Amino acid sequence: SMPDLLTNVAENYVNQDLFAGIEWRIDQDGKPIFQGCAGVKDIETRTFIPKNAIYRIYSMTKPIVSFLAMMLIERGVFRLSSPIQNFDPRFKSMKVIDQHAHIEPATALITIEHLLTHQAGFSYDFSLGCPISAHYRDAQLIEDGGRDLTDMMGVLAELPLVFHPGTQWKYSISTDVLAHIIECATGERVDDLLQRLIFDPLDMQDTGFSLPLDGASRLMEVYGMRSLHGLPALKPAPHVLVPADLGSSHPTDDPDFRRGGHGLYSTLDDYMAFANMLLSGQTPEGETLLSPAVLKLALAPRVHFGARGMRINDEPFAGYSWNLLGRVMTDVGAAAYATHLGEFGWSGAAATYFWVDPTKNMTGCVMTQFLGSQHPIGSDMQAAAMSMLG
Amino acid sequence: SMPDLLTNVAENYVNQDLFAGIEWRIDQDGKPIFQGCAGVKDIETRTFIPKNAIYRIYSMTKPIVSFLAMMLIERGVFRLSSPIQNFDPRFKSMKVIDQHAHIEPATALITIEHLLTHQAGFSYDFSLGCPISAHYRDAQLIEDGGRDLTDMMGVLAELPLVFHPGTQWKYSISTDVLAHIIECATGERVDDLLQRLIFDPLDMQDTGFSLPLDGASRLMEVYGMRSLHGLPALKPAPHVLVPADLGSSHPTDDPDFRRGGHGLYSTLDDYMAFANMLLSGQTPEGETLLSPAVLKLALAPRVHFGARGMRINDEPFAGYSWNLLGRVMTDVGAAAYATHLGEFGWSGAAATYFWVDPTKNMTGCVMTQFLGSQHPIGSDMQAAAMSMLG
Amino acid sequence: PDLLTNVAENYVNQDLFAGIEWRIDQDGKPIFQGCAGVKDIETRTFIPKNAIYRIYSMTKPIVSFLAMMLIERGVFRLSSPIQNFDPRFKSMKVIDQHAHIEPATALITIEHLLTHQAGFSYDFSLGCPISAHYRDAQLIEDGGRDLTDMMGVLAELPLVFHPGTQWKYSISTDVLAHIIECATGERVDDLLQRLIFDPLDMQDTGFSLPLDGASRLMEVYGMRSLHGLPALKPAPHVLVPADLGSSHPTDDPDFRRGGHGLYSTLDDYMAFANMLLSGQTPEGETLLSPAVLKLALAPRVHFGARGMRINDEPFAGYSWNLLGRVMTDVGAAAYATHLGEFGWSGAAATYFWVDPTKNMTGCVMTQFLGSQHPIGSDMQAAAMSML
Amino acid sequence: MLIERGVFRLSSPIQNFDPRFKSMKVIDQHAHIEPATALITIEHLLTHQAGFSYDFSLGCPISAHYRDAQLIEDGGRDLT
Questions:
Q1: Which of helix, strand or coil describes residue A8?
Q2: Which runs of E-coded beta strand occur in chain C?
Q3: Which residues on A lie below 8 Å from D36 (Cβ)?
Q4: Cα(C94)–Cα(C160) distance, integer angstroms
Q5: Of B194, C218, C299, C361, which one's alpha carbon is 20 to 30 angstroms from that of C158?
Q6: Do B59 and B65 contact (CB within 8 A), yes or no?
Q7: What dotted CATH number matches B1-390?
Q8: Binary contact (B383, A80; C-beta < 8 A)
Q9: Buried/exposed code over B235-266 (b: 16+ C-beta within 10 A; e: otherwise)
Q10: Which residues on D lie below 8 Å from C385 (Cβ)?
Q11: Are A219 and A211 in contact (CB under 8 A)?
């Protein structure tokens, strides 16, 4: 009897010219219950959303790379408490800088756990008001997509952190450091490890750091005016449907391009395979990608926040704590939109969004391409899906 | 389908020359589900691990002696709140020393509970940076194994504590004080009480403070460079497979040698009988060693830690609180390796380790001999076992 | 011995500074003075008579003294909100290190400007939540932009704390210079000329070179930039000519600033310093009354445990008054001084002090941007030790 | 006197004159060791605010290592 609020949210966003095209799917017990799409591939030609449409998922790369870390921990490659300097000595002797210009040596070693929890003290190029982000932009960490991960990390390693490892939380480039440390610890490339440990077993054939062979025609167009590497803006970018210029930050066909915090291309269908797996740690066939005990370890609330709560550039994530893979709902009474205790997932800067809701055996994903949305489409579709499932 | 991660962890430690020989067993519902061994008795001759191999379990002595205390409390010999001075007046008039050289009388009496929780204010010879450990080494408390417990306690009793009883936590010599107070309260020897109250009923024929008659040939060789009585090192001892010199701290055939905090010899099989009993407080036959209510009293979280957490010489025990017998997992979201809420146990300095996991009806023990390991083998095998049991 | 000469000649001999001049006066007459080195190391020309220096932040005490004069004359007062004179500063915002922006809960006043408690920052401020936007705006870099227009760009940026609640060395003296222009209807350079330079016979001090100044201008060395990405460690101390870009022109008849930009000479700066002992010219004409001079010099901002710091460099035992630093605890001082000693310094290593307990003034002139050697304080210590 | 003569000053980091004092560590009463967050200066030495201790210091987290080192005991060892 509840109407289809999902289609309504998405059709309105498209009809109000706020997003070009949107796809979504919600699965329960591993099968789709709701799905649809709205709009077009691009508003310039109005080509229809192709099948297996491809999206830059930006930071939805993080749960994937984090899960790989959990698999390697389970396999004994390293452990939560492993100092990353053991794998890359360039991260020995870190310094810490503060807002009063004072610099001093770090009082603790950065560990694998610090990376996964964004408590290592790293920042991000786009971070507004940050004591070190100016030096990240000068270094072109995000801007220079053509630079090999290994080389970007050498440049990052020379920069000071913005607090002592383990003592604070700040959403950061640390998942990129994780990807690198993974390469250091295993002797392998993070893209190959992903391919064989996660994508192949889950049949995510369209996911990777470059377009598939027939990928160009399926790539959704990206809009919006937010920059992830420019001088951080003092007020939100205006929400205008104008193609986004990604510069050289996000190549389509660079076989060496790989990152921990962004850069994957994927599809609604591929990302839903990953999300569904998170409900159990198994492939649909029943291969174990991660044991129940280490999955519990990965999902448990690990970082708790003060009254100010979890924030990124002052944007709130109300009632969310942080676990080893991303956000997790720890207080429905503090939540700003419909959810259930234990709901988890993450999202990407081009407005892609996903969640997993263990109390409903439910997963959801909204795919779209808008950089700097002033409308939280992801949270709106989640709310809509929540309202529709009892 | 999950592979045997236990054997893999252990074979790798042996093949990388990090440990000489390792045995492990994991029981569920009181029967072995996984077990194995790797390496040899000693690398000098490469003799194979004999059956019923014997290990110095060091601080895994503590849960045993603590459990005895709980049995005597149940029997009315003393109670948690009993001031120990009631049994040994040498512990009247304690003093407290601080890092600023200031000494003053203790403001509270040390109780049986303080001993079991390491909140009595005692320290340890090996304690780095401690306001009193220098005086413990001068006194040769750990070094002089040949000294009778009763006499060592008289010497210890004259020393100041490092905080007021009940006001802080510091892992200490207090289980040795407990063993002594047990002797004072009962008129009996702690080794005889152990033998008849615990070992005999559980058929632990190879456990005790001296080698059995046929014990010498079965004693595993001990390696490593950590000293438990020397000037505390400023950085970890290098991890080298070189036989360890125990001086006279750990005699093999001294019929009067007995301690509360270390000194037992045991076997994988004996220690597993003790661990399994902890799941219920009964022998396999069904004799009650400790009622459910006093077992609940012993296992409940009793000491809680600040953000710094539980630490020993600055080594962390993440997400662990302390109960009357040793560590207990109170927050899986703070844990640094795979576990379940309520998991408990302890470990010894020669890298022996055990756990009990009530949510899985599971016990595990890893036996090895390396003093000053820079690799946490115990936690690695636990993680491996966790990953293998759903 | 002549400690001042030993200190200067060793600096020159270790190739740390090209040329140095110093004079120390007592009771308005010289008691120590000298010079060492050369105008430039390239030609090894001797320091010319009446050599000219970029005094950078030694501009602030002069512009601040001008403000005190206007205050005495009723043009405005310490509590005057600057928004009254330039509405572009109505509705300020405050940004923090966590990206949070909110409206300022207090109005910026004249007093806030003089005490660097307004919440403004600086282009060169390392780790600062707003300095990146100052650099992008080219506030220091673009010397060719008229003061008035530059202020318009600055006024749109957030502060880094709520006016009156913290201290941070800042562009606020430039704002002061600008607010002076708004309040008086006159230019700050003309006001300075008329009210201060002429009465003190400071004929060589101004925002552009005199007709015969080109040959007198000391060469400037060092690699510190006041507008580039703030360095994570001090640049190497090497005598190489400094590139000033378009930040500090020599003959722009419109260049005027409050926080830097004056050219001066040792002799001229000493006349200004000597005047600060009394608020009068040598002939006895009053530039500022004793009561308002007392008001200007009294310790006004006090500091906590870290003390006064600029980009984390300490000013030990110093508090702040309306003109600059003032020694309030000799037992915390890092170099010889007396209670009440005051003055300021410039980024090219110029430095001056006034010591009322000894009727003493002193000034050290050199041109080195980014010195790793506190020459100013070394020379003050030497003079103090010679009395 | 040396300060007055310009040999060094109160704020001079001692590591400038003996690099063996570059990269100091700080130990606490809980066994935790971490790098020093500030450079020892001449002024720190004169005021006993450098973090050094003494062999005879009762209850001190580092004095046992001073005694083991024989810093006071071994009068025959050259200062350097």
A1: helix
A2: 19-26, 29-37, 53-54, 93-95, 101-103, 263-264, 308-310, 313-315, 318-321, 324-327, 342-343, 351-355, 360-365
A3: 105
A4: 5
A5: C299
A6: no
A7: 3.40.710.10
A8: no
A9: eeeebeeeebebeebbbeeeeebbbbbbbbbb
A10: 4
A11: yes
CA atoms of C157 and C137, how far apart (whole Å):
9
Q: Are C367 and C221 in contact (CB under 8 A)?
A: yes
Resolution, Å (one decimal): 2.0
Q: A295: helix, coil or strand? A: helix
Q: Which tokens sit at B225?
A: 């460079």
Looking at domain C1-387, its CATH class is alpha beta
**Residue C193 burial by CB count (10 A; 0-12/13-18/19+): exposed, middle or buried?**
middle
Contact B58, B349 (CB under 8 A): yes
And the tokens for A370? Answer: 């808008």
- Give B80: exposed, middle or buried? Use CB within 10 Å, 0-12, 13-18, 19+: middle
- Rg from Cα positions in chain B: 20
Q: How does strand B362-367 pair with strand B353-357?
A: antiparallel
CB proximity A105 to D under 8 Å: yes
Give the Å distances, CA to CA, from B88 to B85, B93, B176, B181, D7: 5, 11, 14, 7, 64
From residue B135, alpha-carbon distances to B96, B125, B259, C108 in Å are 13, 8, 19, 62
How far is the CA of A272 from the CAs of A276, A360, B79, C259, in angstroms?
Answer: 6, 16, 58, 59
Contacting residues for C13 by C-beta, under 8 A, at least 6 apart: none
Assess B100–D contact: CB distance below 8 Å, yes or no. yes
Q: Which residues of A touch D35 (CB under 8 A)?
A: 105-107
B373 closest CA partner among B4, B46, B16: B16
Neighbours of chain D (3+ CB pairs under 8 A): A, B, C
Residue/partner pairs of B355-360 with CB below 8 Å, 24 or more apart: B355/B275, B355/B382, B356/B275, B356/B278, B356/B279, B357/B386, B358/B279, B360/B28, B360/B389
How many whole angstroms separate alpha carbon B38 and alpha carbon B48?
Answer: 9
What is d(CA C121, CA C311) in angstroms, rounded to the nearest whole number? 11
In chain D, the residue whose alpha carbon lies closest to the alpha carbon of C315 is D11
Nearest partner of D43 among A118, A33, C335, judged by Cα: C335
Of residues A74, A288, A297, nearest to B335 (C-beta): A297
**Neighbour count for residue D75 (Cβ, 10 Å):** 6
SS3 assignment, position B363: strand
Under a CB-based contact definition with an 8 Å cutoff, are residues B272 and B252 in contact? no
CA end-to-end span of chain C: 11
User: How far is C140 from C224, CA to CA, in rounded Å?
Assistant: 14
Non-local (6+) Cβ contacts of C288 within 8 A are C65, C68, C69, C72, C279, C296
How many residues does this entry show for chain C?
387
Question: Which residue in B47, B367, B346, B368 sits closest to B224, CA to CA?
Answer: B368
Contact indicator for A261, A136 with CB cutoff of 8 Å:
no
In single-letter form, the type of residue at position A209 comes to F
DSSP string, C147-174: HHHHHHHHTTSPBSS-TTS-----THHH
The CA distance from C348 to C364, in Å, is 11
Distance from CA of C384 to the nearest CA of D (A): 10
Method: X-ray
**Those residues with Cβ within 8 angstroms of residue C316's Cβ, 6 or more apart along the chain or in another chain:** C307, C332, C333, C334, D10, D11
B7: which 2 tokens?
Answer: 């054997």
DSSP label of D28: -
- Measured between CA atoms, how close is A329 to chain B, in angstroms? 14
Q: Is the dihedral of CA C68, C74, C79, C81 positive or negative?
A: negative
Contact flag B129-D62 (C-beta cutoff 8 Å): yes
CA distances from C293 to A291, B315, C340 (A): 77, 61, 13
D61: which chain B residues are within 8 Å (Cβ-Cβ)?
Answer: 99, 128-131
